[PDB]
Design a protein around this ligand. Structure first.
Ligand SMILES: Nc1nc2c(ncn2[C@@H]2O[C@H](COP(=O)(O)OP(=O)(O)OP(=O)(O)O)[C@@H](O)[C@H]2O)c(=O)[nH]1
Ligand SMILES: Nc1nc2c(ncn2[C@@H]2O[C@H](COP(=O)(O)OP(=O)(O)OP(=O)(O)O)[C@@H](O)[C@H]2O)c(=O)[nH]1
Ligand SMILES: Nc1nc2c(ncn2[C@@H]2O[C@H](COP(=O)(O)OP(=O)(O)O)[C@@H](O)[C@H]2O)c(=O)[nH]1
Ligand SMILES: [Mg+2]
Ligand SMILES: [Mg+2]
Lengths: 84, 431, 70, 437, 378, 30, 33, 437
């Protein structure tokens, strides 16, 4: 039987028939290696169910938004069904 | 990973290779039984560069032992680290060359070269990268010279794209050693010219000198010399092994040290060779490490670098070090000893640094020198060769084994043509 | 006799004292840029790579290029 | 979105990247494991890190760079040291055989094996990319992988990616100190390819960084770590306007259209100020006049050639931190009234300035100090011609009798490309002379 | 991502058809981790609702015997299928009985507020007197020492408010939130309990608790059982009817409404929480019938669970109906928030359908409506 | 002023770390 | 008017450019015999 | 209603079957003994499993599979394995001998002695079926049972039943890797019979799944388990729209009316994305554009054919998981505007998109990571003709020497059948080449 200290270096040169070849360095490092997802996970994306047709806004929230959108120029000299 | 194989031929080559294997094994943390008892991970990050993978916790070194006498094999098995080698690559004859180049090349050459190449193929096709071949043979011997040169030729014929460093142990210029020593030296340097992508020639007499004048330890014998050569080889091949800020392998050294193809004869050296009584008294740093490795007293080749010019010089360092100090000292040696450097190559030094020093030392360095002064060794070899050749002494043996004076004079002709080629690139001007 | 270490386990380093040190004052400010709405728009515009329903005019010469068969 | 993809090729480039990504992680508050702390987080819509990092699924900010080396040594050091869980496991691309200081070996041989895989990874990183601003390519001219394989990457990025600006930070060889021996051959062979395929080639001299470190930072024994840290600080000061908002924002195309006059003079000079340590910084005022005089002081450029023997063409002053354009333009006026900084006669105004509010960051235990203001000098002088002439001298002296040519010929290079590259750089020198006069 | 094998919370829901006359039975699966509700139909095996995603349904409610409004259908969760849910929801979920003492009748508003803040969901609540026959629930605490006599005196003196609580980890969480059995120990170690901030020394505490298991059963069968006649403390007289709406009760603001009513003058004489039926709510709202277009919305909102009913009297006579109408003034929460902001339905109201408090409009109908709740239905 | 004092304290802590490593290597040599 | 938006970038095209033909990262070299 | 009989014939078919019914049971939440646990309480109107699991009165769900093989070891391994109590024991037809990789053993011998029994078994399943939309025939072109008995079964189901769809999943030999030596003979002999009695033939190749799981899953030694797991994932993604509902969905008639232009071009390539590991998926975004571009990689095709040598006729784009049709349309638009994604001229629009909300499930102890998104690519291309060219070259090379012909001519089959099959497949190749213009 090969002693482990020399088997360390024999695995790089002439290992067993199966089993992935290892280097004489990088051994006795914590072989996390596998059990890892191993890849990038897409990008993101926010879906087009709430960017082209967003959540509906309440009457109070839109009235506050219209309050803020008032005292402009274009929205104040020309409302929909009235005058200035 | 750039794997090299090891070749060790002859008794001296086998002993030097075994010492090299053990001095890289104890810095790799390997017991003689093969079980890794080291504590750091750096010494087995790249351990397959020299050791074949095996079952269990055992690493089996990749070397081939070539000899013609079983006594050397029995001695190296009974010695240290003899059981880490498998008995399959232990090839040996039953007759013995007896320091005979022709007998080791033809009579028992091709009978053993087939088995050696069978083991070499079995190792090399099992290898995946196969950087290079590292031969530690000896010039002047039996199986070391002739069989090793035949191995070099066969390996070049088989794989003509691979780097080989062979070490070509040069005997003592003085004394006598072998009666057929100039014959074997010429017959070996003939093939050292031929394929031999890099040769790191070591001299035994200069090894005695560096052991007696720098390291002391009373008598030199051979173990300290073998340890010196082994440390030099380890410092050479450290970059394929242990990492560093700036690495340089066999191919990088061959590119950065061999200008023209027949300029592959190197003069090595090792630093720091402090004594046991001066280790605690020496302040080992980059400046006097550079001075020690560039000192002429500490060249393990018998040729003195002061009478020649360095073409290229490799400096392979090991330890806690700063590259500014490295290249600053490698420029300072140029600017000081600019006389002993060719002016047609700026930056005649290739640097390399490892940051793992050998155990017990803060710092070490390996000198490699492609000097033009190495041509004096081949000139002396040619002089002794023609002195023993003009009377045809000890040549009937080689003609009986199967060689001829035409091959003798061809080896002499291309060897002294190489000497004149060193002379021409030593005395060549810039403009 | 401790062995020689790596490059990382040195003082004077590439990766020492990186977990316990965190630059608090320098980069907890608004000096660092955000991905706000009009950079998010540019980063989300990347989802229209050559799928836009803009077709070339029949009063333009380059019309039989997009209508070869008729 | 202003993403700035990076390729670090060669041992030198890998070490630059090893310093750079540490600095970027500290600048953007990224832990070495890859995640970002929640108490650090100033909101989930932060966007500074998107230039250099990408967040995959769970705050895992992986860096947008490719590490390249034919020998595995430095990339294995990266894989075993600290920043091991940060990088993608496949992005750290390596071979086995090295080029070993050989342009032909890096270009016509084994370098042509992994080029398809490495720029397939570049292509997949650019597929992940959406707002690609440019290619930050870090290499060295020393040789081998950073010399030939980098040139191959330039060629294929050029005719695959269109305009697509390619800023090339390169470790240029020093005049006297050097490491390789065939380094002049590799530099000469690499310039001939990078000339027609680069857009801003920032040369960095190792000896210049060395003496800057030992006289300004007072580091007696500096090294490659400090070298790459300083280069990382400069490249962060360059591409900080893309990551943070500024009073005057400069991008990688405004920088180019205000820097390069003609489409062959695209070899600027980078310079940082201050490069002073903490002890010297605490005792000095460091106003905008001092940080401009430090940039224009001629022992501070990052290639060993003084600008006094040359004429300035363009200066892309990138101010960083708490600076005001009023001190900036007063300093620009006093630089203009200084006679020794001779501007060229066909360029009346030659100062493109970009102010960024974000103050520079420091590594935990380096040598630069946490200063409230800094500035990146970006010269377009003619003084680089001296460096080109020095490399021509070295290349011709080693090419006089065909030294180190058999290696390239055996690897596959013909004998003519040395002469073609020499003629090309001689033509570049003639262009510099005729535009300087 | 969404799968077919995620966590699933299965229930059987019964919706009474406005036509026909039989209550159809549907299988109601609640997938968490994306909050998606899906619906099968036992008998006439077909498809009723897909994965989708609904708001109303919230993991927090569930609680068998409840009403969920899914696509304007008043489903009643009648029984638990799915042993997975039986181990995920029923486990350590007990029912207690909180008995408010006569000295704690003055602070029953804040007492109800803290019970709702804890999460003790109520099932019945009634204000009675217990007569001299309160000893039948004190047979356990008998003979031993004269606290039995003190207890039967303290029960017959003053009114009593009986509650039937239910929460996870019941009978122990209620005693934890009550603290110990003495006010001295309560303000010694747990100075945030009902017995700590309300009450005095022993046998004159602020509540009773429910002892343990099957003593809770004995108390609940004695008070709110089918065989229990207890009679509320109604006295008619000059009074006004206050109806805390089930939307407010589900959101948990019922105790806040009670505390605000008790704080801003007034007094509560009779408390009783009902579970109104469709025809009973129609007969309560017949005075509106065809004067407001939102009469059907008011009826289907009143038939949505708990129906806290209060008899409000005033020490200062004036007109009790007019004074209570001024305090619980303008019906639309937008009206009450923009104008007269310190009023009920403005502190606690979402829209005109969910007023969260109901008050008697005509001054001659308050006695009729008080008679309808406290003298007809109980 | 507080930023510069904190930076100086960090430099002092780093220099203490290098003193620690050099005395450790000296004890290693001895 | 419905207008054409500016082009983002054409980032090569992974069909004609071919990686293929490469030994995968770090698994020896399958020794031939 | 929209039910599917799966007939798994041959050893490869049986192994794909018992690695696929595991995935089906895990997707539908069925533990291996047969009952759906659902914590012992939940069921009723969830009719998602009727496409693969017939309902018995005891609450036990029996798969609609016919596991048939002549040589009884692999089916006996199924019977003795962990999926023992799942399958109906009479639906586990085994012969007595082996076909031994011979088309004659199966078309003119012992398979003919069991084909009547297998037709009776399929008839007794179809009697319980109440509007069966199509058969799924899992087999290999290797030889013996998977070509022989399988082709005979297909002829008998073409004679019986009639207009009902007859989709097959065919394991094809690799260009280099060959387990047997009579693979070209068996492929040419089975193509002549599956050309006219089929309507859709999904194309996979063992070497291509080897390369895919060798690079991406980085398993150096791929056994057959993960191969059949990947094929199972493909079939699961194909039939996901018949089972679990979602967005725009594509079923057995949609991806035949939108993929088969002429009644001979019905050989689609099925690739899967992302074939990834846990560690590689951790440092990765895995977006819609990336997973769509991964299917058009040359190194993701599950047959070893170069897609450059041929146009695309039609493409079925089967997405699973958290995927959006807007991102799908963006990915399709990028693919269409990339020019060298070469579509044939008689096809302005060529993308049939199906989208399902169910993410894939990973088997315990598996090798794929649980990725949110997945893509199944069903491509009709001219590029499949090179595999037929390679097989014709192999068949001609073996038939020139008259090697391995004596077995076939001695065991009932005639000599001229080889030539008739060769000229039939040559006519098919000529049809593909003349329609690809
Ligand atoms: N600034 C800086 N330069 C470096 C560093 N490391 C190496 N260099 C430069 O690199 C050169 C050495 O050649 P390299 O660039 O390393 O060669 P290579 O890119 O590895 O390619 P090969 O030679 O085939 O291995 C030297 O001359 C250095 O200038 C570093 O850390 N910082
Ligand atoms: N993908 C995949 N292919 C397989 C598997 N098992 C066998 N094969 C293929 O099948 C070929 C061998 O022929 P078989 O399919 O076993 O032949 P058979 O249909 O079982 O008929 P006999 O040879 O008589 O047993 C091989 O070349 C494989 O490519 C498997 O488990 N998965
Ligand atoms: N460095 C060293 N050199 C040696 C040693 N043994 C022998 N030699 C050298 O080798 C030479 C003899 O070679 P030899 O061994 O006979 O070669 P062989 O016959 O092939 O085994 C002598 O000149 C010695 O200098 C040793 O242990 N160390
Ligand atoms: Mg290198
Ligand atoms: Mg079989």
């Amino acid at each position: 039987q090969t002693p482990p200290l020399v088997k360390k270096f024999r695995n790089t040169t002439r290992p067993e028939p199966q089993v992935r070849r290892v280097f004489y360095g990088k051994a006795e490092d914590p072989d996390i290696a596998s059990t890892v997802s191993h890849g990038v996970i897409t990008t993101g994306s926010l879906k087009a169910g709430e960017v082209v047709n967003p959540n509906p806004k309440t009457l109070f929230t839109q009235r506050l938004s219209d309050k803020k959108e008032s005292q402009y120029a274009s929205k104040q000299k020309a409302p929909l069904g009235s005058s200035h | 990973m750039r794997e090299i194989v090891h070749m060790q031929a002859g008794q001296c080559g086998n002993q030097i290779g075994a010492k090299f294997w053990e001095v890289i094994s104890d810095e790799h943390g390997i017991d003689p039984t093969g079980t890794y008892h080291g504590d750091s991970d750096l010494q087995l990050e790249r351990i397959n560069v020299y050791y074949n993978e095996a079952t269990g916790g055992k690493y089996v070194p990749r070397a081939v032992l070539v000899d013609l006498e079983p006594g050397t094999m029995d001695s190296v098995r009974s010695g240290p680290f003899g059981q880490i080698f498998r008995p399959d690559n232990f090839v040996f004859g039953q007759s013995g060359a007896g320091n005979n180049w022709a007998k080791g090349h033809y009579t028992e050459g091709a009978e053993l070269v087939d088995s050696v190449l069978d083991v070499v193929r079995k190792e090399a096709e099992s290898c995946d990268c196969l950087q290079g071949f590292q031969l530690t043979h000896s010039l002047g011997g039996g199986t070391g010279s002739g069989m090793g040169t035949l191995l070099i030729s066969k390996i070049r014929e088989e794989y003509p794209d691979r780097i080989m460093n062979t070490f070509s142990v040069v005997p003592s210029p003085k004394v006598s050693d072998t009666v057929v020593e100039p014959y074997n030296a010429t017959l070996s340097v003939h093939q050292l010219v031929e394929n031999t992508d890099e040769t790191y020639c070591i001299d035994n007499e200069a090894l005695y000198d560096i052991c007696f004048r720098t390291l002391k330890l009373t008598t030199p014998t051979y173990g300290d010399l073998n340890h010196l050569v082994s440390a030099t080889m380890s410092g050479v091949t450290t970059c394929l092994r242990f990492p560093g800020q700036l690495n340089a392998d066999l191919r990088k050294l061959a590119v950065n040290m061999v200008p023209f193809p027949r300029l592959h004869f190197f003069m090595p050296g090792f630093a720091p060779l402090t004594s046991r009584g001066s280790q605690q008294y020496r302040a080992l740093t980059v400046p006097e490490l550079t001075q020690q490795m560039f000192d002429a007293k500490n060249m393990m080749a018998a040729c003195d670098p002061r009478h020649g010019r360095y073409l290229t010089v490799a400096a392979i360092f090991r330890g806690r070090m700063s590259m500014k100090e490295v290249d600053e000292q490698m420029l300072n040696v140029q600017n000081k000893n600019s006389s002993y450097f060719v002016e047609w190559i700026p930056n005649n030094v290739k640097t390399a640094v490892c940051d793992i020093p050998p155990r017990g030392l803060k710092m070490s360095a390996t000198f490699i020198g492609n000097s033009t002064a190495i041509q004096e060794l081949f000139k002396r070899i040619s002089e002794q060769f023609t002195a023993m050749f003009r009377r045809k002494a000890f040549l009937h043996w080689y003609t009986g084994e199967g060689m001829d004076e035409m091959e003798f004079t061809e080896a002499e002709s291309n060897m002294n043509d190489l000497v004149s080629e060193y002379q021409q690139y030593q005395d060549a001007t810039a403009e | 006799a401790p062995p020689p270490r790596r490059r990382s386990q040195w003082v004077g380093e590439v990766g020492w004292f990186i977990p316990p040190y965190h630059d608090t004052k320098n980069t907890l400010s608004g000096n660092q840029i955000q991905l706000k709405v009009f950079r998010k728009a540019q980063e989300e515009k990347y989802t229209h790579r050559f799928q836009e329903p803009w077709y070339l005019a029949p009063n333009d010469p380059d019309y039989k290029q997009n209508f070869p068969f008729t | 979105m202003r993403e700035c993809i990076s390729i670090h090729v060669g041992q030198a480039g890998v070490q630059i990247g090893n310093a750079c990504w540490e600095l970027y992680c500290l600048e953007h508050g990224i832990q070495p494991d890859g995640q970002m702390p929640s108490d650090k987080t100033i909101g989930g819509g932060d966007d500074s890190f998107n230039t250099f990092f990408s967040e995959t699924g769970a705050g895992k900010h992986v860096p947008r760079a490719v590490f390249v080396d034919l020998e595995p040594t430095v990339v294995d050091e990266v894989r075993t040291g600290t920043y091991r869980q940060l990088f993608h496991p496949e992005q750290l691309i390596t071979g086995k055989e090295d080029a070993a200081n050989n342009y032909a070996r890096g270009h016509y041989t084994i370098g042509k094996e992994i080029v398809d895989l490495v720029l397939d990874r570049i292509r997949k990183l650019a597929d992940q990319c959406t707002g690609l601003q440019g290619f930050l390519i870090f290499h060295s001219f020393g040789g081998g992988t950073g010399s030939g394989f980098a040139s191959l990457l330039m060629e294929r990025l050029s005719v695959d990616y269109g305009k697509k600006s390619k800023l090339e930070f390169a470790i240029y060889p020093a005049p006297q100190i050097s490491t390789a021996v065939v380094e002049p051959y590799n530099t000469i062979l690499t310039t001939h390819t990078t000339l027609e395929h680069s857009d801003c080639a920032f040369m960095v001299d190792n000896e210049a960084i060395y003496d800057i470190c030992r006289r300004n930072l007072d580091i007696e024994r500096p090294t490659y770590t400090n070298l790459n840290r300083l280069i990382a600080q400069i490249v962060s000061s360059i591409t900080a306007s893309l990551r943070f908002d500024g009073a005057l924002n400069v991008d990688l195309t405004e920088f180019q259209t205000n820097l390069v006059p003609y489409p062959r003079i695209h070899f600027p000079l980078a310079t940082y100020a201050p490069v002073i340590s903490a002890e010297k910084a605490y005792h000095e005022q460091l106003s905008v006049a001092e940080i401009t005089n430090a940039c224009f002081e001629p022992a501070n450029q990052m290639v060993k050639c003084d600008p006094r023997h040359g004429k300035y063409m363009a200066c892309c002053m990138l101010y960083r931190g708490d600076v005001v354009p009023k001190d900036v333009n007063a300093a620009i006026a006093t630089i203009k009234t200084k006679r020794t900084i001779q501007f060229v006669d066909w360029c009346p105004t030659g100062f493109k300035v970009g102010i960024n509010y974000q103050p520079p960051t420091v590594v935990p235990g380096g040598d630069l100090a946490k200063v409230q203001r800094a500035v990146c000098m970006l010269s377009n002088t003619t003084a680089i011609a001296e460096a080109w002439a020095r490399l021509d001298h070295k290349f011709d002296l080693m090419y006089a009798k065909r030294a180190f040519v058999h290696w390239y010929v055996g690897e596959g290079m013909e004998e003519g490309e040395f002469s073609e590259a020499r003629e090309d750089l001689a033509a570049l020198e003639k262009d510099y002379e005729e535009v300087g006069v | 991502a969404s799968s077919a094998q995620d966590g699933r919370y299965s229930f059987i829901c019964e919706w009474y058809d406005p036509n026909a006359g039989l209550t159809r039975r549907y299988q109601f699966l609640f997938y968490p981790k994306d909050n998606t509700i899906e619906m099968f139909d036992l008998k006439n095996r077909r498809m009723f609702l897909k994965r989708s995603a609904c708001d109303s349904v919230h993991l927090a409610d569930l609680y068998v015997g409840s009403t969920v409004n899914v696509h304007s259908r008043q489903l009643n969760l009648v029984e638990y299928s799915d042993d997975f849910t039986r181990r995920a929801l029923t486990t350590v979920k007990e029912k207690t009985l909180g008995l408010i003492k006569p000295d704690a009748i003055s602070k029953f508003g804040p007492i109800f507020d803290m019970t709702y803040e804890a999460g003790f969901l109520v099932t019945n609540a009634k204000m009675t007197r217990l007569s001299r026959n309160a000893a039948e629930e004190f047979y356990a605490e008998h003979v031993g020492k004269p606290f039995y006599n003190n207890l039967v005196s303290f029960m017959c003196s003053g009114p009593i408010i009986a509650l039937e609580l239910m929460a996870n980890n019941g009978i122990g969480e209620w005693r934890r939130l009550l603290g110990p059995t003495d006010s001295s120990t309560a303000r010694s170690e747990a100075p945030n309990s009902i017995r700590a901030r309300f009450g005095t020394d022993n046998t004159r505490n602020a509540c009773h608790g429910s002892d343990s298991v099957d003593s809770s059963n004995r108390e609940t069968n004695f008070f709110f059982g089918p065989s229990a006649r207890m009679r509320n403390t109604s006295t008619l007289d000059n009074c006004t009817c206050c109806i805390i709406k089930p939307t407010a009760v589900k959101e948990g603001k019922a105790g806040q409404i009670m505390s605000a009513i008790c704080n801003e003058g007034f007094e509560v004489v009779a408390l009783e929480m009902f579970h109104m039926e469709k025809a009973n709510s129609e007969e309560f709202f017949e005075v509106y019938k065809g004067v407001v277009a939102e009469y059907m919305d008011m009826v289907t909102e009143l038939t949505s669970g708990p129906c806290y009913a209060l008899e409000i009297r005033c020490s200062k006579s004036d007109d009790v109906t007019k004074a209570f109408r001024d305090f619980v003034g303008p019906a639309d929460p937008e009206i009450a928030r923009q104008l007269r902001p310190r009023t009920l339905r403005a502190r606690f109201g979402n829209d005109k359908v969910h007023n969260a408090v109901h008050c008697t409009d005509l001054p001659t109908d308050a006695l009729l409506e008080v008679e309808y709740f406290f003298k007809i239905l109980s | 002023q507080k930023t510069y004092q904190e930076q100086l304290r960090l430099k002092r802590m780093r220099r203490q770390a290098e003193m620690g490593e050099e005395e450790e290597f000296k004890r290693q040599m001895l | 008017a419905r207008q054409k938006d500016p082009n983002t970038f054409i980032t090569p095209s992974p069909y004609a450019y071919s990686p293929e033909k490469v030994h995968p990262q770090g698994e020896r070299h399958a020794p031939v015999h």
